[PDB]
Amino acid sequence: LALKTIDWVAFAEIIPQNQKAIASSLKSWNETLTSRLAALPENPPAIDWAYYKANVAKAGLVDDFEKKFNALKVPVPEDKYTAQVDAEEKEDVKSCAEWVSLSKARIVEYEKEMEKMKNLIPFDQMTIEDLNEAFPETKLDKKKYPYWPHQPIENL
């Protein structure tokens, strides 16, 4: 009986909104299954036959009931259900790891580009063409306004 300890708010963050109700059900059943495991020990107390060997005057019937008991094989329930969620877990980590790889690619891109804005030539020695290289937004759209001052006079 080896369980895995579990946080509940950490559980909450990684659920998508489309299956939040199921998550609650996994929470409820998890709580109930803890209570029911608490309210009963592991083994039943097997009663000594002494109280039932010397207190039944029926002809040897206590013996064959107890012979049928020690030789009784209660069916231990088998899993049939954790292997298929382990495989789903494996499949998930695959989808996770490939996304972490993609995000990592977007990180390293932001680092290079951040460094580019970090090591910008000071603004005093900057030609306007150098600025438009730095902030491509400041460029003047020579296609929508071909003629000087290449911008609407209001924005001037």
Binding site: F11, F65, M114
Partner: protein, 54 residues
């Protein structure tokens, strides 16, 4: 950057769904077993004390 690294920390946390269910599959099979134990224990004990009662 800080947003993206937050998502990675979160991705690494994803594993909590699968252990939860695995816990519930673990406990349920433990419950039904122990119930099966108490049921069998208690029934056979009942037939015994009935002989004692009559």
């Amino acid at each position: 950057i800080d947003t993206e690294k937050s998502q990675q920390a979160l991705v690494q946390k994803r594993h909590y769904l699968f252990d939860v269910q695995r816990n519930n599959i673990a406990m349920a099979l433990e419950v039904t077993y122990r119930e099966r134990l108490y049921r069998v224990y208690k029934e056979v004990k009942n037939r015994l004390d009935y002989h004692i009662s009559v």
